[PDB]
Design a protein around this nucleic acid. Sequence first.
RNA 1: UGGGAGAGGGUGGUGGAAUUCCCGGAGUAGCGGUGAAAUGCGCAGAUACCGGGAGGAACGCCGAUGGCGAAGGCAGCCACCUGGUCCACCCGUGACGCUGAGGCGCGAAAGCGUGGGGAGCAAACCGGAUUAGAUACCCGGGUAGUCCACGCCCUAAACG
RNA 2: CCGAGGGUAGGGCCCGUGACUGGGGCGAAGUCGUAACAAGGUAGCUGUACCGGAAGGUGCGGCUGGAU
RNA 3: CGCGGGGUGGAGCAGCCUGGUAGCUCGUCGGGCUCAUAACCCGAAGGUCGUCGGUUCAAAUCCGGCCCCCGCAACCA
RNA 4: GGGGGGAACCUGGGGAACUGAAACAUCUCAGUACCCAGAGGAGAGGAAAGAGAAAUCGACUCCCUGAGUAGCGGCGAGCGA
RNA 5: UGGUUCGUGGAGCCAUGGGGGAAUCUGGGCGGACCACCGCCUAAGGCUAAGUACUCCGGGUGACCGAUAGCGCACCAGUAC
RNA 6: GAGCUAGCCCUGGCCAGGGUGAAGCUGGGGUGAGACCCAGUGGAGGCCCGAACCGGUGGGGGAUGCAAACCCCUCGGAUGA
RNA 7: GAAUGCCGGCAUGAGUAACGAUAAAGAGGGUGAGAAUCCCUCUCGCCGUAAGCCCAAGGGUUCCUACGCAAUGGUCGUCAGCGUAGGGUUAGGCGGGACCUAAGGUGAAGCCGAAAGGCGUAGCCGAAGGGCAGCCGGUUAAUAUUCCGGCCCUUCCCGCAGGUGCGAUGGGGGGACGCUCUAGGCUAGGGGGACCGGAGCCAUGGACGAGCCCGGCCAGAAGCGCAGGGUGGGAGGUAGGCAAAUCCGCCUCCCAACAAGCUCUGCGUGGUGGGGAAGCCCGCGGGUGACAACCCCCCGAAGCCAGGGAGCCAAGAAAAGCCUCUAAGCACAACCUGCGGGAACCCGUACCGCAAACCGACACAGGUGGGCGGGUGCAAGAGCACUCAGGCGCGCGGGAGAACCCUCGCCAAGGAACUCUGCAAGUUGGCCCCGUAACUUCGGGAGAAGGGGUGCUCCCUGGGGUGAUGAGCCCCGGGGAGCCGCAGUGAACAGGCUCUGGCGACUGUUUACCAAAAACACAGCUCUCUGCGAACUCGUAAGAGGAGGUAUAGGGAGCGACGCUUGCCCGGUGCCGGAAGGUCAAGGGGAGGGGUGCAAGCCCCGAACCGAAGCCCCGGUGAACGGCGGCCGUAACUAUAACGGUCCUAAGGUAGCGAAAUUCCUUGUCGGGUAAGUUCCGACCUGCACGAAAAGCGUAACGACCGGAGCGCUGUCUCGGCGAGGGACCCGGUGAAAUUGAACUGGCCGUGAAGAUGCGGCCUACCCGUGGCAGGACGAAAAGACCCCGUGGAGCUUUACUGCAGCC
RNA 8: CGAUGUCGGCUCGUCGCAUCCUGGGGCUGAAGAAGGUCCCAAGGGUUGGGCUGUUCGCCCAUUAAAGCGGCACGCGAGCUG
Lengths: 48, 275
Amino acid sequence: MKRTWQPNRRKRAKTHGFRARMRTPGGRKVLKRRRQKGRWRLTPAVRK
Amino acid sequence: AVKKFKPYTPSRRFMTVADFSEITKTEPEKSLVKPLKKTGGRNNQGRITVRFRGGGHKRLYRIIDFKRWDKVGIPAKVAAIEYDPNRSARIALLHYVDGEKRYIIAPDGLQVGQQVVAGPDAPIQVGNALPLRFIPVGTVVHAVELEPKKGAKLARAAGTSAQIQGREGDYVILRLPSGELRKVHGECYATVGAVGNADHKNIVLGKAGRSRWLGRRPHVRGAAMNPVDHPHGGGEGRAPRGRPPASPWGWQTKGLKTRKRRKPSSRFIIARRKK
RNA sequence: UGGGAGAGGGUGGUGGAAUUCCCGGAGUAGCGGUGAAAUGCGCAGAUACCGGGAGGAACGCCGAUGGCGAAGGCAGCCACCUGGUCCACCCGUGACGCUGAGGCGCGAAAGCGUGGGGAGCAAACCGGAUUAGAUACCCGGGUAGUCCACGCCCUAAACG
RNA sequence: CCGAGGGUAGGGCCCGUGACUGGGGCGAAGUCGUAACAAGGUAGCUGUACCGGAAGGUGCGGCUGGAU
RNA sequence: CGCGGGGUGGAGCAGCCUGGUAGCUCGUCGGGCUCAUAACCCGAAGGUCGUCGGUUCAAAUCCGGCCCCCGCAACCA
RNA sequence: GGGGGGAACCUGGGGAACUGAAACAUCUCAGUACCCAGAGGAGAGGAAAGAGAAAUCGACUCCCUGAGUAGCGGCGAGCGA
RNA sequence: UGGUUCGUGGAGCCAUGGGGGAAUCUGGGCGGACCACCGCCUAAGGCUAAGUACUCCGGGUGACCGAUAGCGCACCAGUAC
RNA sequence: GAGCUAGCCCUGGCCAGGGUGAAGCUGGGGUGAGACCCAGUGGAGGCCCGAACCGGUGGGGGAUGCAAACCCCUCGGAUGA
RNA sequence: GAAUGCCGGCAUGAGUAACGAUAAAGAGGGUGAGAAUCCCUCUCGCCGUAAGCCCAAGGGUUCCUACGCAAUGGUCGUCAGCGUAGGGUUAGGCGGGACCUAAGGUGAAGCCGAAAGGCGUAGCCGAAGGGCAGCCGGUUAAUAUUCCGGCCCUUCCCGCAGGUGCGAUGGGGGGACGCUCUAGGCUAGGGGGACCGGAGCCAUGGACGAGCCCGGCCAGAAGCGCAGGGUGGGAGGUAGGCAAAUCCGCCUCCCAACAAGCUCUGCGUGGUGGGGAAGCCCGCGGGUGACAACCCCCCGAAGCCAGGGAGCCAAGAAAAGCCUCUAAGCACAACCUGCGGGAACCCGUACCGCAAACCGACACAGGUGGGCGGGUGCAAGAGCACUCAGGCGCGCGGGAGAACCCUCGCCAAGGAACUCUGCAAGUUGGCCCCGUAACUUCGGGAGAAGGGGUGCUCCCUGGGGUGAUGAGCCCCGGGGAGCCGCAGUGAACAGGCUCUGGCGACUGUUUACCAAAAACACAGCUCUCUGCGAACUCGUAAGAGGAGGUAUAGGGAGCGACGCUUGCCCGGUGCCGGAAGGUCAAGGGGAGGGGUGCAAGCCCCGAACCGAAGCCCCGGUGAACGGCGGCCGUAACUAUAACGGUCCUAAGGUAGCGAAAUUCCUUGUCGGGUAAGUUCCGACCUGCACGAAAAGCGUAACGACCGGAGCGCUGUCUCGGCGAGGGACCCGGUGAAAUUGAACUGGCCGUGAAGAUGCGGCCUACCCGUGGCAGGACGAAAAGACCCCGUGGAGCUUUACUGCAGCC
RNA sequence: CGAUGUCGGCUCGUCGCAUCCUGGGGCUGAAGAAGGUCCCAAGGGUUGGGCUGUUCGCCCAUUAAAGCGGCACGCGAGCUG
Ligand SMILES: [Mg+2]
Ligand SMILES: [Mg+2]
Ligand SMILES: [Mg+2]
Ligand SMILES: [Mg+2]
Ligand SMILES: [Mg+2]
Ligand SMILES: [Mg+2]
Ligand SMILES: [Mg+2]
Ligand SMILES: [Mg+2]
Ligand SMILES: [Mg+2]
Ligand SMILES: [Mg+2]
Ligand SMILES: [Mg+2]
Ligand SMILES: [Mg+2]
Ligand SMILES: [Mg+2]
Ligand SMILES: [Mg+2]
Ligand SMILES: [Mg+2]
Ligand SMILES: [Mg+2]
Ligand SMILES: [Mg+2]
Ligand SMILES: [Mg+2]
Ligand SMILES: [Mg+2]
Ligand SMILES: [Mg+2]
Ligand SMILES: [Mg+2]
Ligand SMILES: [Mg+2]
Ligand SMILES: [Mg+2]
Ligand SMILES: [Mg+2]
Ligand SMILES: [Mg+2]
Ligand SMILES: [Mg+2]
Ligand SMILES: [Mg+2]
Ligand SMILES: [Mg+2]
Ligand SMILES: [Mg+2]
Ligand SMILES: [Mg+2]
Ligand SMILES: [Mg+2]
Ligand SMILES: [Mg+2]
Ligand SMILES: [Mg+2]
Ligand SMILES: [Mg+2]
Ligand SMILES: [Mg+2]
Ligand SMILES: [Mg+2]
Ligand SMILES: [Mg+2]
Ligand SMILES: [Mg+2]
Ligand SMILES: [Mg+2]
Ligand SMILES: [Mg+2]
Ligand SMILES: [Mg+2]
Ligand SMILES: [Mg+2]
Ligand SMILES: [Mg+2]
Ligand SMILES: [Mg+2]
Ligand SMILES: [Mg+2]
Ligand SMILES: [Mg+2]
Ligand SMILES: [Mg+2]
Ligand SMILES: [Mg+2]
Ligand SMILES: [Mg+2]
Ligand SMILES: [Mg+2]
Ligand SMILES: [Mg+2]
Ligand SMILES: [Mg+2]
Ligand SMILES: [Mg+2]
Ligand SMILES: [Mg+2]
Ligand SMILES: [Mg+2]
Ligand SMILES: [Mg+2]
Ligand SMILES: [Mg+2]
Ligand SMILES: [Mg+2]
Ligand SMILES: [Mg+2]
Ligand SMILES: [Mg+2]
Ligand SMILES: [Mg+2]
Ligand SMILES: [Mg+2]
Ligand SMILES: [Mg+2]
Ligand SMILES: [Mg+2]
Ligand SMILES: [Mg+2]
Ligand SMILES: [Mg+2]
Ligand SMILES: [Mg+2]
Ligand SMILES: [Mg+2]
Ligand SMILES: [Mg+2]
Ligand SMILES: [Mg+2]
Ligand SMILES: [Mg+2]
Ligand SMILES: [Mg+2]
Ligand SMILES: [Mg+2]
Ligand SMILES: [Mg+2]
Ligand SMILES: [Mg+2]
Ligand SMILES: [Mg+2]
Ligand SMILES: [Mg+2]
Ligand SMILES: [Mg+2]
Ligand SMILES: [Mg+2]
Ligand SMILES: [Mg+2]
Ligand SMILES: [Mg+2]
Ligand SMILES: [Mg+2]
Ligand SMILES: [Mg+2]
Ligand SMILES: [Mg+2]
Ligand SMILES: [Mg+2]
Ligand SMILES: [Mg+2]
Ligand SMILES: [Mg+2]
Ligand SMILES: [Mg+2]
Ligand SMILES: [Mg+2]
Ligand SMILES: [Mg+2]
Ligand SMILES: [Mg+2]
Ligand SMILES: [Mg+2]
Ligand SMILES: [Mg+2]
Ligand SMILES: [Mg+2]
Ligand SMILES: [Mg+2]
Ligand SMILES: [Mg+2]
Ligand SMILES: [Mg+2]
Ligand SMILES: [Mg+2]
Ligand SMILES: [Mg+2]
Ligand SMILES: [Mg+2]
Ligand SMILES: [Mg+2]
Ligand SMILES: [Mg+2]
Ligand SMILES: [Mg+2]
Ligand SMILES: [Mg+2]
Ligand SMILES: [Mg+2]
Ligand SMILES: [Mg+2]
Ligand SMILES: [Mg+2]
Ligand SMILES: [Mg+2]
Ligand SMILES: [Mg+2]
Ligand SMILES: [Mg+2]
Ligand SMILES: [Mg+2]
Ligand SMILES: [Mg+2]
Ligand SMILES: [Mg+2]
Ligand SMILES: [Mg+2]
Ligand SMILES: [Mg+2]
Ligand SMILES: [Mg+2]
Ligand SMILES: [Mg+2]
Ligand SMILES: [Mg+2]
Ligand SMILES: [Mg+2]
Ligand SMILES: [Mg+2]
Ligand SMILES: [Mg+2]
Ligand SMILES: [Mg+2]
Ligand SMILES: [Mg+2]
Ligand SMILES: [Mg+2]
Ligand SMILES: [Mg+2]
Ligand SMILES: [Mg+2]
Ligand SMILES: [Mg+2]
Ligand SMILES: [Mg+2]
Ligand SMILES: [Mg+2]
Ligand SMILES: [Mg+2]
Ligand SMILES: [Mg+2]
Ligand SMILES: [Mg+2]
Ligand SMILES: [Mg+2]
Ligand SMILES: [Mg+2]
Ligand SMILES: [Mg+2]
Ligand SMILES: [Mg+2]
Ligand SMILES: [Mg+2]
Ligand SMILES: [Mg+2]
Ligand SMILES: [Mg+2]
Ligand SMILES: [Mg+2]
Ligand SMILES: [Mg+2]
Ligand SMILES: [Mg+2]
Ligand SMILES: [Mg+2]
Ligand SMILES: [Mg+2]
Ligand SMILES: [Mg+2]
Ligand SMILES: [Mg+2]
Ligand SMILES: [Mg+2]
Ligand SMILES: [Mg+2]
Ligand SMILES: [Mg+2]
Ligand SMILES: [Mg+2]
Ligand SMILES: [Mg+2]
Ligand SMILES: [Mg+2]
Ligand SMILES: [Mg+2]
Ligand SMILES: [Mg+2]
Ligand SMILES: [Mg+2]
Ligand SMILES: [Mg+2]
Ligand SMILES: [Mg+2]
Ligand SMILES: [Mg+2]
Ligand SMILES: [Mg+2]
Ligand SMILES: [Mg+2]
Ligand SMILES: [Mg+2]
Ligand SMILES: [Mg+2]
Ligand SMILES: [Mg+2]
C-alpha cells in the first residue's frame, strides 16, 4: 500500500531546500544552527 | 417558463430547468469576458472564510455596464440575449451606434432589435437609464445606483423590482425588493422596468448534483457534529438543541438582529423589511 | 342593408368616499363595548380634530318588482378586442328544421397547488360575559381564506 | 403431428370463512343535554371548510320551503 | 431492600412551617318558586384531623414507631 | 556608508508555563527560558533637576560589608533594597 | 500602567499611553499623601576610555578522567545510520 | 511538516462492450383552432447488466505472516456528487 | 545481585519453525578442484490487456567487458543487480532553457505591523497548457529520431535582385477552448487469397495435390487526385477601441452564394532510398534462400482532415508566437519576397522502469501516471479458454504418501433437522423466443415469476455493404429434411427465487488500520439575519473571502423526495418592540466638613440634583430554549362511563400511531403461520416512559443495512466416508524468536496466605528420545482499559468561580 | 489488579447419590394389571425437534426413563462470539 514517501526532486528542493530556508527567519536560524553544529549538509542533498 | 422532465430517473421526477426561450446567442462576446478566479471559500490567507463552497463548473465572467452614464444620450441597439452563469438574470448585449459594445442586464419584456439610451432626456420605456429624480413616481425600476457615480447596487437579481413611492428634496423614496423604504439620492441612475428571468425562483434542482455544478458543497448540520466543532453537537441520542440555537462561533440564529446601531445609513431608511 | 338600448364577456388603465397603519401639529382622563358588565385599549399622552404619506378591498345617490345572458352570474369611469339578442325594409338562398344517448365546453361559494397581496371582515384558536354546564348566539384580539395570475376540484334550495 | 387426462407455474371471476373494527336496522318504559315544528327562544334549509362528546356551532355563498 | 410526600365532615382540596381558633365548593336536610322535576333564593346540620405514645398550660399542628395510599431511585461490573 | 556571519558575555523591544504555594485565581517560578533588533572587544551607565538628615557625600561601573537589616506579602508561600 | 522592596496601601520618587496645559532665577523639581519652615539639586539635547563579564582561540597548572570513564568524537564526526 | 491522508485552486489524461428508448423533429390522425393519440426518427439519465479504474460487503486462510492492513472465493460504483 | 535497570558478550528454545506463491520440472553434453542451481541442446509447463514492448516519475553505475568468490544471494554457485579494473551516455529538428502566461509565489509603487514580518496594482518567476523545423534504414560489446546513408525543414547574420509608408514594449483580429451523441472520406491494425516468391516434406493407413509451411511491406520533398477545415467582396460616412490609424467596431449603397476563388492540414500515388520470413550452415549473433515476391479482395477504429456537424445546461483559462493598423524615429534607413554564402549555445540522452534497480528496514504475493497490447471460437468486448512475437518456471532440493491444518473434488437415503441466523458451500446462470401479478409518483415492479429452443450435415430462400447491377468476400436473417451422444452457452467467463415486516426516499459519504448502517450528505420545506464599505468569517492592522454577487441574492439554524398534516401554553430562559418610570459607573455639580500657614492661599473628603448601556418593568414571539394534569361518583343485569363534583396549572397530549428500534411487570390477551413460534405478521390499548420540523402517519422504486416465512438445491446436519495436491513426517543444506531464578520438575489425601512437582503421609514410578493432544505449571505477551486511590492529567458542558477576545 | 479471560452453546469426559428408567425388597386403604411410600443399589442407560443468546423453562412426537448435582456456574494456550 501507498506509503508515506513518494519522492519528488522538485518538491524536496522547493520545501526543504536552500532558498526556502534563507527566505524565512525560521530557516535562517536553521542553517545557523547547523553551521553552529558542524554539519556537512545544511540543506538536504537534492539531486537536481 | 419552466421546463419539466418525465421521471425517467428519480432525479428527473422533480427536476426543472429554465426554458431558454429567450436566449438569442449562444457564445458570448470575446472582447468583454475575463476569467473568474474561483475561490472555494478561500481568502488570500487560504483559509475558508465561508464554508461549503467549492467544486463548481468553470465559468467566464462577463463585464457589465453597471453605470450607463458613461454614454449619455448615445443610443444603442439590443444585439442579443445571452446566458450568464454569474447572475440570476440574463444579459443583453448592446450594440451602441458608435460601435462600442457593452453588456447590460436584461429587463423583463425587452426584445431584440429595439433601442435603448441613457440620460436625463431619456424616454420612459423599458431598459432606458435615467437619474432617479427624472423618473416619475410609481414606476417600477431596477439596477439602481445607491450613491451616485458609484455604480449600480440595487435590484440586480432576477425578477426584481423597485417602486418609486416619491420624492423628498434632493432624495427620492424607493420600495426595495425587501420592502425596505429607503431614501436614495436623486442623481443616482436607475434603469427602467423590472428584471427578466422571473421564473428563476421556480427552479427545482432535482438532486444533489446541480448544487455541486453550481459550486455549493454539502452543508452539514451543527447537531451532526461533536461539540468541539459546534455548540449543538453531540449528546447521546439525537439532541434537541438544549440552548438558544446558535452559530458555530457563538451567536444565535433565531432572531438576533445585527445591523450596526450607529450606522450613518440609518438616517436614510424609513421602514425595515417585513414578513 | 340601416338603426337601436343593455352590470354580456375579456384585457389594460384611471377617479373618488370611507376603514386600518405610519409621520407631524394641537389637547386631556378615559375610549371602546353591552341588555347590563368585563376582557382590552389609555398618562409610555389614548378617544375626538386637522394636515400629509403608504396600503389594499368594494363602487354610495342614480338604482327599481328594472336591464343582460342558455345557466353560473354580471354594477365607478375610460378605452381596445368581442358575443348574444331586437326593429324596419320584405332584397337574396330555398326546408338547410327540431330534440339530442354519448362527447366536448361553461359551471356560485367554500377547498387544493406554485408565486404574489393582505386595509377591513372572518371558521379554527385565545380571552371576557351569559349559563347548572356554553366548544354558541354578545363582546375584544385574531391565522388560513376572501383579491390578482395559472392549473385543479364540478357540488347546491344550480329554484321559477 | 394431433390428442383424453395427469403435473408444474402465474392470472381472472365467484362462494364460504376470519381475531378485530366502522356504521346501520331493530329492540314499552336506562343515561346526557335540547338542534328542528311559533320569529322554537340565535329564521330555517343547503353546498363546502373548520371545530365539538352528542345533537350541532361558526365562516363563506345561495334559496325562501322565513315570519314581522 | 432504599429515600420523601399524603391521610381532616360523604367526595375533592385549604388550615400546620411561628401551637389555642377546623375554612371553600359540591353533596345531604327543611322551606320558598313551578302544574311538576332540575336550575335559582332563604336557612341548617355533619369532624377520634389514620393511629399508639408522650412532650407542653394546652396538639390537626411538634418528635419517634406502626397502618394504609402516592410516587421516585435501585448505577460501573 | 549599510546589509551578512561570531561559543558565550552586553543592551534594548516583546515575553510563557510546568512548578512552589502541599488544591488555586492575587502571588511564585521571573522579566527567568525563548523570539527579535543592535552594538565590540567589550556593551550598559556616566558628571547630579542625585542621594538623606551629618547643615554631610560629591559622575558612573564592579567586589566585600551594610543585610536576610529596613521593608514588601491571599502579612501565606516567599520576595528583598 | 510599568520600574524600585513598594501586590493601592498613608503611595511619594523615576519612566508615560489619554485629556487639560504655563513660567525663565521674584524661575522649577526633590527631601515618601498635604501645608509651613529649613535644606538638596537645576529636568525636558548628546559624547566619554579605567576598574566589570564571557572564552570559538594560544600558552600555563591540576590530591581531573584514563577508551562503557573523559567533550557526543583520543581513530577520517557531528560521519555511518 | 499537506511527497500519507482531508479540502480546495490551476492544468492535462482515463471509463471495453452490451441494454432501456425521455425531450425534440418529421409524417398520419383529431378539433373550428388547440390539447392529445399513433408511427418512424431521435439517444436524454446523479439509468440498468458489466471489465480497466475507484472501493472494501460477507466468509474462509493469514497472526514471531508475503504484508506494522495481505491473499483467495463473494460483493458495491463504474458519464458521475 | 536484583531496579520488566544501562552497554557489550554468550547461552535456552533447537538442529525445531521457516527458506517469502501448489506456474513444474526431466535428460545429455560442456566448463570446473567442486554443479539439482553456471553455459548449450532436446522434451515439458506458465503469463500472453501480460508475467510482452516504448515512455514519464524516481533510482544514480546497477549498462557492456575482462579477472574472481571472503561476504550480500533465505541452500549451492564457476553465476549475478556482489568485489577489482577498463570501456560506455554524441542532437539546429526529441524533451528543458535563451518564447508565453494560469493557480500560486516573489514583488519597484503604495498600505499595514512593538521587532521579526504581513498584504499588495504594474512587472517577473511559475507547465506534462499555448507556440515551435525530422521521417526511414544501418552500425557498436554498451549509445542512437543523437554517429553514418537517403530524403526534408527552422532561426539568425551577410551579400545580391526586385516590391511596399517602413516602423511596437501600443490599438484590433486570431490563438480560444465544455459535455454527450454523430456523419463522410482516410490511415494505423488485422483477416482471406485458387495470384506472386522460396528453402523444403510425402512420415503411420490415404494423399503429387488449386497439397503443407513460411512471406507477399516502410518512408518519401515538388506536382496531382481524393476527403476536409478555415474564409464573403468593393465604395462612403463614422463621435467608439483612453494619443494616431488606411486595422477593428457601428450605419448606409452595391456585388453572389449546399457556391466559387485564395489559403492550410490529413491521406494516396509519387524521382528515389531501404527492409525482406520459414529453413539449415556455424556459433548470442552471422551467410544463403533471392535477383526475392513485393499484387488483389475483406474487416476497420476512440487515431487523422479538425477549430467537422447535431443536441444540452452546469454555459465551458491567460498571455505570447502569427496577420494587420498607425506615433514618436527614419525616411542613404527600415521591413516584404526569391536565391547564395556563412553561424547554429547550455542540460538530459547508459540502465531498471507494475519492478530483485523506484515507495514498503529485505532480491518483501503490497502501491505506482501515459501509449502499443496480435490471432481463433465464444452475439459483442481491453472479459474468459488456448496460443504468435517476446519473456518466465518465481534463488533450497530428494523422498515417503500417518493423525491433523489450508485449498479443491465426489456421494448414498433424508433435505436446514445443524444453527445466534441456510454462516458457509450448493441449484439457477449467457443469448433468443413465449410470457410476466398485486402496487404505483405511470417512469417503474421486471431479467418479476415460469417455461421452450441453443450442437452437426444437406437443400431452398430474403435483406444490407463492398462492388459494377456482376463475381467474390463480410454482415444480418427465414424455412424444410436428416445425423449423434447422457449432455449441444457440450470446457472457461455469467443472477437462486418469492411473500411480508422495520428503517432511511432515492444515486452517493463515513470511523486510512475491527463498526458502511437506521449514522452524514442530498434536492425539497420553514424560521431568522443581511440595503452594500451588507450580514458573516480570517487577520491586532492592512487586506481579503462574501463577491467583482445585490433580497428570485448572501450568511446561520432545523427537519430532510413526495401525499395528508403540523393543534394548546408567553408563567420562567431566549430574541424582538417600548423616548415614561425605578436601579445604575466614570464625569458634571460643590451643600458642608477636615489639614496647614499669621495671612492671602495650597491640599484632602464630600450630600441633594443632572447623568448611558445593561438590568427591573410593559407587550409580542414555538418550523425559538421548553411544557402539554390529579381524585371521587354516576346508565333498568353485571361491566365500563358518553355525564357531574372538586384541587392545582401558564396550558393540561388534538389528528394520527401504539407491548412499537420505545412495553419494567411481560413469553401482556386474542388471531394467523408451524406438529409444536420468548421471534415475525394482523388486532386490542393499562403508552412504567409515542406523538406532531430532536416532526407525526403513511408511501411506488431503490438498499452488500435488520428481523420473519416459504419454494428450489445442497457435506450446514443424523454422520460421516474416500480421493487430490500445498505443508506437516524422513534425508541433505542454511537455520531464528517470544521466554528463561536455578532444577535431578509424578499422583491421591491433607497442609500451608486459600487452588502444591518442592512441606507431611501413603500410592505409583528403570535411563533417554520421536510424532502427536492440549488439563496444569494460577503458561507468555501488555506495571488492569472495568473499580478505587492521588488535594495526578487531559478533552467536553454550564444559570460553577474568575478572566479574555468580541460586541453594546 | 507487573491480568485469576466472564455467560451460553459445540467437542471431550470423569465423579457423588439425596435415584428419572431398568434390578431386588417392605408396607399399602396392595384383588389382578397399573399405581403411592420407604429401604438397598451408580453396572449401564437417560431421544429428536419449535421458541429465544439463552442457564432454566413452555410446547410437539416418542420413550423404559427423558435425574439432580460438582469438576475456576468443568472445559476460549481445543472451537465458536
Ligand atoms: Mg564539508
Ligand atoms: Mg567535508
Ligand atoms: Mg479574454
Ligand atoms: Mg496570495
Ligand atoms: Mg503565503
Ligand atoms: Mg442567465
Ligand atoms: Mg456524532
Ligand atoms: Mg479541531
Ligand atoms: Mg478546529
Ligand atoms: Mg462549545
Ligand atoms: Mg446540545
Ligand atoms: Mg461520539
Ligand atoms: Mg435520547
Ligand atoms: Mg341599487
Ligand atoms: Mg325576396
Ligand atoms: Mg372560490
Ligand atoms: Mg386545508
Ligand atoms: Mg375583527
Ligand atoms: Mg372561549
Ligand atoms: Mg364549564
Ligand atoms: Mg392583524
Ligand atoms: Mg390550508
Ligand atoms: Mg395552505
Ligand atoms: Mg368552480
Ligand atoms: Mg393437450
Ligand atoms: Mg391438459
Ligand atoms: Mg329548542
Ligand atoms: Mg333557531
Ligand atoms: Mg364554532
Ligand atoms: Mg342561485
Ligand atoms: Mg463498566
Ligand atoms: Mg466503567
Ligand atoms: Mg458510570
Ligand atoms: Mg549584525
Ligand atoms: Mg528581554
Ligand atoms: Mg501549586
Ligand atoms: Mg518578578
Ligand atoms: Mg559604552
Ligand atoms: Mg555640569
Ligand atoms: Mg521576584
Ligand atoms: Mg520580582
Ligand atoms: Mg506600583
Ligand atoms: Mg503622558
Ligand atoms: Mg519630576
Ligand atoms: Mg514632594
Ligand atoms: Mg530629595
Ligand atoms: Mg580497556
Ligand atoms: Mg561516547
Ligand atoms: Mg493534497
Ligand atoms: Mg497529497
Ligand atoms: Mg447511453
Ligand atoms: Mg449508473
Ligand atoms: Mg458494475
Ligand atoms: Mg453495475
Ligand atoms: Mg488503459
Ligand atoms: Mg473509502
Ligand atoms: Mg475483504
Ligand atoms: Mg477469520
Ligand atoms: Mg464489481
Ligand atoms: Mg517479559
Ligand atoms: Mg519443539
Ligand atoms: Mg516437528
Ligand atoms: Mg519444515
Ligand atoms: Mg516458493
Ligand atoms: Mg575438467
Ligand atoms: Mg498459455
Ligand atoms: Mg535503493
Ligand atoms: Mg558498486
Ligand atoms: Mg549485467
Ligand atoms: Mg558468494
Ligand atoms: Mg578476494
Ligand atoms: Mg551462499
Ligand atoms: Mg571455474
Ligand atoms: Mg560488478
Ligand atoms: Mg542569444
Ligand atoms: Mg508577499
Ligand atoms: Mg514572463
Ligand atoms: Mg512547456
Ligand atoms: Mg508543450
Ligand atoms: Mg522542440
Ligand atoms: Mg502410407
Ligand atoms: Mg498476408
Ligand atoms: Mg507512401
Ligand atoms: Mg483614438
Ligand atoms: Mg505528396
Ligand atoms: Mg535477411
Ligand atoms: Mg464542433
Ligand atoms: Mg505580456
Ligand atoms: Mg503598414
Ligand atoms: Mg542559405
Ligand atoms: Mg539515448
Ligand atoms: Mg535508453
Ligand atoms: Mg503500466
Ligand atoms: Mg525491493
Ligand atoms: Mg526471489
Ligand atoms: Mg515485489
Ligand atoms: Mg490508489
Ligand atoms: Mg493503477
Ligand atoms: Mg486479443
Ligand atoms: Mg460452436
Ligand atoms: Mg485476462
Ligand atoms: Mg522461493
Ligand atoms: Mg449427501
Ligand atoms: Mg441422491
Ligand atoms: Mg427437500
Ligand atoms: Mg438444536
Ligand atoms: Mg451465503
Ligand atoms: Mg427466466
Ligand atoms: Mg459432433
Ligand atoms: Mg470498407
Ligand atoms: Mg457463468
Ligand atoms: Mg419487531
Ligand atoms: Mg440510504
Ligand atoms: Mg476502520
Ligand atoms: Mg481510531
Ligand atoms: Mg456501502
Ligand atoms: Mg467494515
Ligand atoms: Mg418536504
Ligand atoms: Mg472587498
Ligand atoms: Mg469576486
Ligand atoms: Mg435528521
Ligand atoms: Mg402517496
Ligand atoms: Mg413561555
Ligand atoms: Mg416568554
Ligand atoms: Mg412575561
Ligand atoms: Mg408623564
Ligand atoms: Mg460623582
Ligand atoms: Mg437607563
Ligand atoms: Mg409545534
Ligand atoms: Mg386540544
Ligand atoms: Mg400497545
Ligand atoms: Mg412508551
Ligand atoms: Mg419537535
Ligand atoms: Mg424522521
Ligand atoms: Mg411510520
Ligand atoms: Mg417502506
Ligand atoms: Mg446497503
Ligand atoms: Mg448505496
Ligand atoms: Mg518438502
Ligand atoms: Mg525425575
Ligand atoms: Mg509430592
Ligand atoms: Mg509432596
Ligand atoms: Mg526429527
Ligand atoms: Mg497443558
Ligand atoms: Mg496444537
Ligand atoms: Mg497469564
Ligand atoms: Mg499496575
Ligand atoms: Mg481503550
Ligand atoms: Mg481534595
Ligand atoms: Mg484532584
Ligand atoms: Mg485536579
Ligand atoms: Mg508476572
Ligand atoms: Mg441410598
Ligand atoms: Mg427400583
Ligand atoms: Mg422396585
Ligand atoms: Mg401388585
Ligand atoms: Mg448459570
Ligand atoms: Mg457460582
Ligand atoms: Mg465456567
Ligand atoms: Mg478464545
Ligand atoms: Mg490456560
Ligand atoms: Mg484453558
Ligand atoms: Mg457481539
